[PDB]
Paper text:
Following oxidation of the α-hydroxyl group in GGE by a Cα-dehydrogenase, stereospecific glutathione (GSH)-dependent cleavage of the β-ether linkage in β-(3′-methoxyphenoxy)-γ-hydroxypropiovanillone (MPHPV) is catalyzed by the glutathione S-transferase (GST) enzymes LigE and LigF, forming β-glutathionyl-γ-hydroxypropiovanillone (GS-HPV) and guaiacol. LigE catalyzes stereospecific cleavage of (βR)-MPHPV to (βS)-GS-HPV, whereas LigF catalyzes the cleavage of (βS)-MPHPV to (βR)-GS-HPV. Consistent with their classification as GST enzymes, LigE and LigF each adopt the canonical GST domain fold with an N-terminal thioredoxin domain (residues 1–82 and 1–76, respectively) and a C-terminal α-helical domain (residues 93–255 and 93–242, respectively) connected by a short linker (residues 83–92 and 77–92, respectively). Biochemical and small angle x-ray scattering data suggest that both LigE and LigF exist as dimers in solution, and these dimers, related by 2-fold symmetry, can be seen in the respective crystal structures.
LigFΔ242-GSH crystallized in the space group P6322 with one molecule in the asymmetric unit. Well defined electron density corresponding to the GSH molecule is also visible in the structure. The LigF dimer forms via interactions between helices α3 and α4, in the thioredoxin and C-terminal domains, respectively, of each monomer, forming a four-helix bundle. The dimer interface is largely polar, lacking the traditional lock-and-key motif or hydrophobic surface common in other GST dimers, specifically the Alpha, Pi, and Mu classes. The LigF dimer more closes matches those of the Beta or Theta class, which, like LigF, lack a hydrophobic lock-and-key motif, and there is no open V-shape to the dimer interface. Additionally, Gln-52 and the backbone of Val-53 interact with the cysteinyl moiety, whereas Gln-144, His-40, Tyr-148, and Gln-39 anchor the glycine residue of the active site GSH molecule. Due to the occlusion of one face of the GSH binding pocket in LigF, we propose that the substrate binding site is located on the opposite face of the LigF monomer from the dimer interface (black circle). Because LigF Ser-13 was the only potential acid-base catalyst revealed in the active site of the LigFΔ242-GSH structure, we hypothesized that an SN2-type nucleophilic attack mechanism is responsible for catalysis in LigF.
Author numbering:
A (entry chain A), B (entry chain A): 0 to 242
Write the structure that this text describes.
Amino acid sequence: MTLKLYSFGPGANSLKPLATLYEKGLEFEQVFVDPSKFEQHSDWFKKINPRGQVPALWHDGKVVTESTVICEYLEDVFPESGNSLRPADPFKRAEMRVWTKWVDEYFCWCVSTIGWAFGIKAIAQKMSDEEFEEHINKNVPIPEQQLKWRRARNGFPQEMLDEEFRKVGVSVARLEETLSKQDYLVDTGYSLADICNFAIANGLQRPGGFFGDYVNQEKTPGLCAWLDRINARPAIKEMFEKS
Amino acid sequence: MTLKLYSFGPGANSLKPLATLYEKGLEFEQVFVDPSKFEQHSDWFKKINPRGQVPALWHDGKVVTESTVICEYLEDVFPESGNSLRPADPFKRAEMRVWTKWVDEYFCWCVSTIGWAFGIKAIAQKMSDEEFEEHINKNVPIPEQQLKWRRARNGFPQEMLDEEFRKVGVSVARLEETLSKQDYLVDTGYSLADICNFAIANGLQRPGGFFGDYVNQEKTPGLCAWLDRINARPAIKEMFEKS
Ligand SMILES: N[C@@H](CCC(=O)N[C@@H](CS)C(=O)NCC(=O)O)C(=O)O
Ligand SMILES: N[C@@H](CCC(=O)N[C@@H](CS)C(=O)NCC(=O)O)C(=O)O
């Protein structure tokens, strides 16, 4: 392979370039970095990405990081491969970037914060207390992430959780505002905007889940039809089938 | 004019498309939205950008918002005008976006938070207490900004300020890490990466200022030479001269 993707599979930030690769029909080696073994903190992976986070794209010896950047990189380099995922119209491509950067600056983080608090409790508590601290202190380069791991194992402040939940509500209302009126986030059709937002939103509609009161047929029919729509796409089904 | 920029002039988020326009030699109407009169919350400006924030680009009846997006839009639409501000090499253009999104997701906000706390005290306190609250409650659409205005007039929590200061330190160390070794943030030369970071960093080196202990010749010679370098560019001098 001349293209390799290092990631956690199809969820959160990893899903963005994974979906992009399958939508564009690009051949690549799908490398699973196993979070249950903290492989993102392994010496061999930090050689690929010294930040110690996924996703990371390897292309002919060059490493591209940041999920949103990798997707734009794939469109910059393979504009003629499979589905075209940025509008040709520059005004529509601008609108697309407003959506993708909003995922990076707002939507991903409130959902993620709730995920760190409740979602990876088992990984977060695998090691003994000192073994945990040993790993964090010498193998997690990123300070903001050191604190997140500590709070994942030991607890997030309550008022922090309350605020994060409110922002999820804001985020879901914003999506519904648009998706209740059109099929995709930019009206030129399916784009990186949909992919980046789907990366965060897919799973929120789970009955009995964390956000069932926010995302459902009654409150957000637009959002739900969009989630269904993207999940019906052949490349998205292929992504989940082969992961 | 077919191009108009609505902004606060050459500082913070407004500086990014302003510098881009001058670097590309593009003709445009420079429209000053006066923050001392809260014009960003005026009915006439919210018609242009319903978010009630600057900058906003008007181009033939189309409005482009988000400072970083506007710069990319100008390169998408006028790639052959004046200085070229994105690398032609897609791997280098990816590296550029890592820098610009890092401004949007980290660097701008810690600097900005300190700015809201200490910087706009006079505007923040212009109106009476009820007149202040009246304006905030009916004329500032954005919730996160309602709270920022309240904290600008009434006070930010101490521990919040301490943390924000630490992140500024992290931000400045990261810049020095690169600029101590090369002239511009991406080694292909001056780009939107430099402009977006300069928008936040310019002014930090002010003697007797907020961040004099972080940014100076002793601690960050690389950062300081870069600041000087960009300030010597003819288009940047022109920007400040004509603002
Ligand atoms: N800004 C980065 C964030 C990357 C990121 O947060 N990755 C998460 C997975 S969604 C991760 O690596 N978590 C493992 C860890 O921090 O230990 C991007 O969009 O790629
Ligand atoms: N994400 C937006 C942020 C825009 C923004 O924060 N603008 C500030 C000036 S730097 C503003 O309008 N402040 C006025 C207010 O919120 O009332 C962008 O990069 O354009």
